[PDB]
């Protein structure tokens, strides 16, 4: 078994910026990693392609994953609307950590965030399931369009995504 690598191609108001690839820890959180992997290939008939990063706060994180309502309120898992917090073995140790956004205990859907700093206050509350493998400079470039309140000054979209390995 080798952990899956998935990629996103980011565009800023339609102009391609670059590729970010992620390693997903299916060896520690198989169910959360599988959810992100199938949503990145679109193989269940819905997924991240074409969705946006709706909330970016420089120094904190970039958040996206709402492919249903697009405004930050929706999204869903490949298991039904929401699923359980698989475990909290991994922490939010520094830039590059991939973790699930939620609305309290056991409410995981499709929304996720990429940490641009250690965010230890989220440990034990949000399930960490991946890391940026390549393209951290694209994530850094994305923060430039965010603000303290999270609204972005340009539309940041996942122009394409899929599985590499």
């Amino acid at each position: 078994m080798v952990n899956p690598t998935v990629f996103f191609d980011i565009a800023v108001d339609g102009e391609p910026l670059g590729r970010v690839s992620f390693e997903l820890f299916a060896d520690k959180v198989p169910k959360t990693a599988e959810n992100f992997r199938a949503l990145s290939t679109g193989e269940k008939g819905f997924g991240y392609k074409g969705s946006c990063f709706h909330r970016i706060i420089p120094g904190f994180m970039c958040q996206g994953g709402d492919f249903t309502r697009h405004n930050g309120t929706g999204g869903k898992s490949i298991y039904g609307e929401k699923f359980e917090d698989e475990n909290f073995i991994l922490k939010h140790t520094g830039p590059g950590i991939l973790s699930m956004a939620n609305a309290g205990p056991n409410t995981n859907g499709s929304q996720f965030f990429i940490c641009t700093a250690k965010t230890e206050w989220l440990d034990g509350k949000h399930v960490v399931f991946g890391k940026v493998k390549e393209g951290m400079n694209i994530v850094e470039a994305m923060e430039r369009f965010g603000s303290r309140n999270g609204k972005t000054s340009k539309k940041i979209t996942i122009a394409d995504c899929g599985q590499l390995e």
């Binding site: 930050g72 999204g75 956004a101 939620n102 609305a103 206050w121 999270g150």
Partner: peptide, 11 residues
């Protein structure tokens, strides 16, 4: 504040 939630985004 600095949280990541779906539904009611808190400070």
């Amino acid at each position: 504040x600095l949280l990541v939630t779906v539904a009611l985004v808190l400070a």
